Every structure is written in C-alpha cells, then in structure tokens.
Design a protein around this ligand. Structure first.
Ligand code: HEM
Ligand code: HEM
Ligand SMILES: CNCCc1cc(F)c(F)c(-c2cc(C)cc(N)n2)c1
Ligand SMILES: CNCCc1cc(F)c(F)c(-c2cc(C)cc(N)n2)c1
Ligand SMILES: C[C@H](O)[C@H](O)[C@H]1CNc2nc(N)[nH]c(=O)c2N1
Ligand SMILES: C[C@H](O)[C@H](O)[C@H]1CNc2nc(N)[nH]c(=O)c2N1
Ligand SMILES: [Cl-]
Ligand SMILES: [Cl-]
Ligand SMILES: [Gd+3]
Ligand SMILES: [Gd+3]
Ligand SMILES: [Zn+2]
Lengths: 400, 402
C-alpha cells in the first residue's frame, strides 16, 4: 500500500508513507497512466484538517491553543459561512502549498518565503501597488528573494480578485499578417487581451506586457509596470562574441500569477508567487521550444554547425551554448539563477529531508527532470510518487 | 469519454480510445501516480486466446470468415482437451509484432511491422538454444546492416520447466567487482558476471569482456556458452575531432538484444524470446557511458576536453555528454553499423503515433522512457502528452530464474 521508491543510481529504497494522506484524486487509474498530461459546510472538514496540520507542525497538537483555534473556526463558519486565517496560518499555508507542489524542483527553499498579506486589498489600484511592492522586494536588485502576495480569498456573492496575466512579467507576442508571431508565442492571447483593453502595443520581440488586474465584479484594469521595476538581463555568451548581437533578453523574476492558492478549504484566486529562474527554463524552454522563441537554428547558423544532418547533434550543441549564455549573462548581471545540475542536486537533498520530515514527497518526474541532459542529473534516476496534498497551488480557469 | 491528449508544440489534440482496451492494470491509482517507477484457470486463458485470435483475424481483414470461426473453435477445443494450445506460425509472427507494437517504453516502434520472427518452438536443449541464438545474432547483425529479429523458444507448459536465457541481453560486458567496491567493466552486469563465474566461466580482467551466455533448458541447470568473437560485432569509439577520445579504449557492441523478457501472446507465455533491433545512440553515449553507475566516463572526458569541471554552471557535463554521443554516432557510422540518433528516432516515433492514432485510435507510450535522456525538449516527443497502458500481445518483465 505504501509505494516502494527506488533510486537507480545508488540503489537506495524508501517507502512513501505520505501519499496515503493525498486529498484530491489525480488523473491516473490502474488501467492507464496520465502522468504526462499537463492539465488533468464541507469547508469545516478541510479547515479542521488544516488547523490540525498546523498545530501538529508547531508541536502543539491537543493543546488549549489548538482546541481554542478549532472552536474559533467552527464559530466563524457557523456565523459567516467561511473563516479567516490568522497571519501565522496564512504563512504556514503558503509555505506548505509550495512544499506540496509536485512540479517544483526548487522546493529545497520552501521554508524561506516572504508572505505579503494583501487580504485587506480592495480595488485594482491597490492590487497594483501590492504587486509592485512584491516585484521590488523579490527582485532586490538581482539578489532575488522568494515571495508570495496573497490577495483576498474568494467568498460567496462576490467576484474574485484575479491577475489575468499568467506571470507578472511576460513578453508580448504579436500575431503577424501571415500567421507567424513576433515576440513570445505563448503570450498571444494575453497580448491581444491587453490591446483590446486599451494597451498601445509595441512592435518588438521583448516588449514587457502591462498587467490586467481584476478587482471583484469589475472589468480588468490595465497597469503599466514601471520599466525600472522590471529587471531584465541582456543575453551574451562568454566566448561567442556574436551572441550578444542577437539581442536576446530575459527577465529576472519568474512570478506566476494565475494559480489558485488553497489553504484549509479557503481559496485565493490571486496569490502571485515568485522565486528565481532555473536556467533551463530560459535557455532551453523559453528560447529553444519550437512554439516559443524558437531560436535554436538561428544560433546553430551562427555557430557554423552542420545543420544538414541530425546526427551532428547540432541542436544539442546550440542549446547547450544558449544555456551557457543564460547562466553567464545572469551571473554577469548579478541576477540570481541556478543551473539545472545544482537545482536537481538540491532537490535530491530536499527529497531526503522530506522523507525524514514527512515520510515522502509528492514529485512529478516529467517536470522535475530538466529538459536538457535529463540523465546527467540525479533526479532522472530517482523514482518518484505524484499525489496531491493540501495546502496547494492549483490550476484554475482563465477569468474569461 | 477517453483520455484527451495534447501535443504542446503544434496544439493538436487527440483522444486515446485504444486505452479503453487496456486489459492488465498498471501501478497508478487516482490517489497517486507511479508512472516513473521502473518495475511496478482455463477460462481466462480462453478469453485471452479468443481476444488474440480475433486480433489476428482483424489484422488480415478476415473477421467472421470460416477460417476465423474454425480457429476460435479449434483453440477452445484444444484448451478443453489439453489445457493449452499452440499458435499457428502466422499467429506467432503477428503476435511478436503486436507485442513490439504494444511496448510502451520502445521509441523505435515505427519499425514494428518489419520483424524477422525465428520460430524456435521445437528447441529441445540448451545446446540448440545456443544454435538458435547464434543464428539470430548472425542474421540480425548482418555485418552491420542490422535487422530487427526475435527468436521464439518453446512456450511455458505445465509439467516442464521453462526455457530461460539468464543474461539480460545476448551481448553484455563483464562487471568485475573489485574488493574496494569499485567495478571494472560494466557495473550493470556484476550479478550475471558472478553467476557466470559461479557456473565455471574463467573471467577476464578488462572493461569490455563479452560475457558468456547462461542458457537454461527445462528442468536443467543453466549451461555456459561462449559466443564466438567473430559473432559479436563491436564498434571502437573515436571522436571525429577529439583525437585523444580513441585512446580511452572505449567500445560498444552492434546488437541490442534483450533476452530476459517474457513474450505473452493469447495467454501463452514464452519466457525465452530474445529480440533485437539497433541502437539509439543515447542508450550508449548517454546512459551506458555517462551514467554514474555505468561506465561513468563523463568527468574524464570533460577534463580531457579541458572543460572547467569545478563549477556546474559552465555546463561541462552537458558539453562532454554531447561529444560522447557524437563519438558514438560517428563511430557507428564509420564502422557501418546501423544506429539512429535521438532526433531521428523521436521524429519517427511521432510519425508512429500519428499512424497508430489512425490505425487503432491511440498508442500506449511511457513518456519517461520515450523522451531521450539528453536534449529532451529538443525532441518532439517531449511536447507530446502520452497515455501509458498495457495491451496484449506484450513483452513483460519476469523474475530472474535464479
Ligand atoms: C526559489 C527558487 C525556485 C526555483 C529555482 C523554482 C523552480 C521551478 C521550476 C523549474 C518549475 C517548473 C516551471 C516550468 O517548467 O515552467 C517550478 C514550478 C513551480 N514552482 Fe517553483 N521554483 C522556485 C520557487 C518557487 C516558489 C517561491 C513557489 C511558491 C511559493 C514555487 C511554486 C511552484 C509551483 C506551484 C510550480 C508548479 C506550477 C505548475 O504546476 O504549473 N516555486 N519551479
Ligand atoms: C528497430 C530498432 C529499435 C530501436 C531504435 C529501439 C529503441 C528502443 C529504446 C531506445 C528503448 C529504451 C531502452 C533503454 O532505455 O534501456 C527500447 C525499449 C524496448 N524495445 Fe525497442 N527499439 C528497436 C527495436 C525493437 C524491437 C525489434 C523490439 C521487439 C521485437 C523492441 C522492443 C522493445 C521493448 C519491449 C522495450 C522495453 C523494454 C522494457 O520495458 O524494459 N524494440 N527500444
Ligand atoms: C503552468 N503553471 C506555471 C508553471 C511555471 C511557469 C513559468 F514560466 C515559471 F517561470 C514558473 C516558475 C515559478 C517560480 C516561482 C520559479 C521558477 N523558476 N519558475 C512556473
Ligand atoms: C528488460 N528491459 C530491457 C530494456 C532495454 C535495455 C537495453 F540495454 C536495450 F538496449 C534495449 C533495447 C532493445 C532493442 C530491441 C533496441 C534498442 N535500441 N534497445 C532495451
Ligand atoms: C507533454 C509534457 O508533459 C510536457 O511537454 C511537459 C513535460 N515536462 C515539463 N517539465 C517542466 N518542468 N515544465 C514543462 O512545461 C513540462 N512540459
Ligand atoms: C527512475 C526513472 O524511471 C529511471 O531512471 C528511468 C527513466 N527513463 C528511462 N528511459 C529509458 N529509455 N530507459 C531507462 O532506463 C529509463 N530509466
Ligand atoms: Cl518562464
Ligand atoms: Cl544498452
Ligand atoms: Gd561566418
Ligand atoms: Gd582536435
Ligand atoms: Zn500515473
């Protein structure tokens, strides 16, 4: 019943006892595995379970404080149909949701999270102020600091706070007259949403999009990020002197803004969180994916590689140098970045910590293994168990 | 409904209706996915036999024919009289091809229709096993123009032990455990090496000593057979521009021939049915040579490339691994031994997926095994959602017979 989990490089065996606590059901069944798919008063039970989790974590289970808190949440839900987290519980909840995220290789950091409490927020203008403060704090002039800002929870009879943008920093993607894209093809939809809401578009490949911020029951409002708040890194290569001329750039801060934060049955549809980049996200996925910037063959051309035969591994050589350029450029710019070897090594340490702390760790193998040099990293050889724990970050529908 | 399956590179969406035909269960439950784990009654025989006969007669466009109905009745009668039944030669060939076609962890399945099936169900001894195995190796190797082949030894039957090939592949390099814990040779083969020594093999002392075969005839201890060196085609590894790479003395063999899996067709089990194709270069260059628990050459190659190995962010591991894969591809092409790189192989697997969507409404595929171990997202299969499930005919894992 407890899955046996093996590391094939060392031969070590663990049993994941934590998965027995999985709440939501995942997409797999005994008949077929869908692990590779990207997208697959009951409040009182989830609330009680969360309070118990928290008071267990702080070694206060069954204490007067524990029982007092349980009675308070019961009284709130009975009186109001919902309840409010204490600040300490909010901070614990956000950290746990990160800790529980199966697709995050960066969870060695999960205990170090700045939690900005924006639950008093009203109006998109206030939202923007909170978001700018978050960006400022998290960017920290390149010495990036993981942070989350939590906007008011969902409640009956009132619309949600929503950030329409998938991230706080996104590059525009402009559909061209012939169906191609200038800029980031991942952002065509949000780009034309910004334009339809009054944004004057640019004409460039790396135009930072405005933010579309939705206060409850209002249309989204456009907010322009002050340019000095959006740290970017021009990409250069340590020995390929022509790389800099390609004018490639990426931004310092990965800040996911479209996921729902769920804590104790409470739902925060706007809770943008940020850390720092793992270099393969930029150099391999964002720049080399065929449906993203797709610059691999451009770089291969500039490297004089034999692009007439796949067996020259010209694609692999070009991608590696793009990843080198990303790492070199962020380090030169003094912007926090982690390469995929360091990140996976730390994630192995995290798995070991979590085995001792909780008896296991939900982990999505396809997402944890980096998109280049998979088996050069230790996580490739590590069997993993994927399951859903709460508190959690969840996908949610786009607010349109 | 059925699983909806997206390709994220193109945006195309299909539904895997074939998954609804999955007979055996995998390891996942709604509570937790175990997809990344390597190793997760005459009436059931009749249902599996009936299903397979139906598959066969569908495949040749003969469903409902007098031949179809006659075969169903013959199998039912034979099972009732004898407890088992015997495949017709054409059904064995279809079943072997289907088992390959059904193999979720095989990226080279575009080739599934081109399989030479050697019928060794008449084999009576370990000596004759070796004769069949040597003929398989000679045929499949084809002086480097490799040909996919399977040799099917007699099925499991009550009253008699199994035919078994103890070795996991027909070609394996010895792994000699050294007293300090290290391994000379291939650390993946330490156990079969010690078994070979236990059964009277005089070991070598090199890193690329081809192991003898331990062949088990029914109810018999395994018997040791040495492969004639001229039968085992090997490729010395050199690099087109790293001239010192050749001095590493690295080699690999031409023929990937898996010999420890069980072939299951229509409820019949063939515990000895070695099959072979040709290598994808990442199996050799990335896994076999660069895995820390295999030949583990990555740092020595990176140092000889004078890369800076003191920090991970120079991506020295990545650079050395690419050049080792280059060396494998170059060396196989130079030796005129069939090999496919991971770009070509994954592109052809995408064609296979498209072919199978039209032919069967889906394709069982194990994402973690299909996506190559370097340059994953540079290949189209990384962006392809996949559904993993078990169809029969099948190649299955089985316990080691010791
Ligand atoms: C501190 C450095 C961090 C690193 C290096 C890191 C690394 C990563 C990477 C590489 C991914 C996969 C992203 C992709 O492929 O698009 C990811 C996903 C994720 N990260 Fe982290 N992360 C960090 C911090 C954080 C923080 C602070 C949070 C939340 C408070 C977080 C929550 C998540 C979640 C929820 C996902 C999964 C999103 C999804 O399921 O689509 N991460 N992270
Ligand atoms: C024709 C050229 C072929 C190529 C390029 C190819 C490629 C591959 C590769 C790269 C793997 C993964 C192996 C590993 O990572 O250790 C694999 C697995 C597999 N192949 Fe193929 N293959 C070929 C032919 C065949 C043939 C002829 C058969 C059977 C008749 C076959 C059946 C299988 C099976 C059953 C597996 C999975 C074994 C397991 O689950 O452990 N393949 N193949
Ligand atoms: C589809 N769901 C969003 C997944 C996603 C997309 C993305 F583009 C990112 F950049 C990060 C991400 C987030 C954090 C906090 C750190 C980091 N390195 N990456 C996560
Ligand atoms: C029991 N699990 C076996 C998995 C495995 C291991 C291995 F070392 C291989 F080489 C192949 C393999 C097999 C074929 C026919 C072609 C090819 N390219 N690889 C398959
Ligand atoms: C189809 C497949 O699940 C998809 O391409 C996945 C693969 N693994 C991934 N892994 C990470 N970290 N991020 C991703 O976007 C993806 N995409
Ligand atoms: C733990 C993990 O499943 C293991 O390392 C897998 C990953 N994917 C693989 N993919 C292939 N093709 N071959 C393998 O041996 C493995 N090993
Ligand atoms: Cl990103
Ligand atoms: Cl191999
Ligand atoms: Gd020139
Ligand atoms: Gd030279
Ligand atoms: Zn699964």
């Amino acid at each position: 019943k407890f899955p046996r989990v093996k590391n094939w490089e060392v031969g070590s065996i663990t049993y994941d006892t934590l998965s027995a606590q999985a709440q939501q059901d995942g997409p797999c069944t005994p008949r077929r595995c869908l692990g590779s798919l990207v997208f697959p008063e009951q409040l009182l039970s989830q609330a009680r379970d969360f309070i118990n989790q928290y008071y267990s974590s702080i070694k206060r289970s069954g204490s007067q404080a524990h029982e007092q808190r349980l009675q308070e949440v019961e009284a709130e839900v009975a009186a109001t149909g919902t309840y409010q987290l204490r600040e300490s519980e909010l901070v614990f909840g956000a950290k746990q949701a990160w800790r529980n995220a199966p697709r995050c290789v960066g969870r060695i950091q999960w205990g170090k999270l700045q939690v900005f409490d924006a639950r008093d927020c009203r109006s998109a203008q206030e939202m923007f102020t909170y978001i700018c403060n978050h960006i400022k704090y998290a960017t920290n002039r390149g010495n990036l600091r993981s942070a989350i800002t939590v906007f008011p929870q969902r409640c009956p009879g009132r619309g949600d706070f929503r950030i329409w943008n998938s991230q706080l920093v996104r590059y525009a993607g402009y559909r061209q007259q012939d169906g191609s894209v200038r800029g980031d093809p991942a952002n065509v939809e949000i780009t034309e949403l910004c334009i339809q809401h009054g944004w004057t578009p640019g004409n460039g490949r790396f135009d930072v999009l405005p933010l579309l911020l939705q206060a409850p029951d209002e249309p989204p409002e456009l907010f322009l990020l002050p340019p000095e708040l959006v740290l970017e890194v021009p990409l250069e290569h340590p020995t390929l002197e022509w790389f800099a001329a390609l004018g490639l750039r990426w931004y310092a801060l990965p800040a996911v803004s479209n996921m729902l934060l769920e804590i104790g049955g409470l739902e925060f549809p706007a809770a943008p969180f940020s850390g720092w980049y793992m270099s393969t996200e930029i150099g391999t996925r964002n720049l080399c994916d065929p449906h993203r910037y797709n610059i691999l063959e451009d770089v291969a051309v500039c490297m004089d590689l034999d692009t007439r035969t796949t067996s020259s591994l010209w694609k692999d050589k070009a991608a590696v140098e793009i990843n080198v350029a990303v790492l070199h450029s962020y380090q030169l710019a003094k912007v926090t970045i982690v390469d995929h070897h360091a990140a996976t090594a730390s994630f192995m340490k995290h798995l070991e910590n979590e085995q001792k702390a909780r008896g296991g760790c939900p982990a999505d193998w396809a997402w944890i293994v980096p998109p280049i040099s998979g088996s050069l990293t230790p996580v490739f050889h590590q069997e993993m168990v994927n399951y859903f724990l709460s508190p959690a970050f969840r996908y949610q529908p786009d607010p349109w």
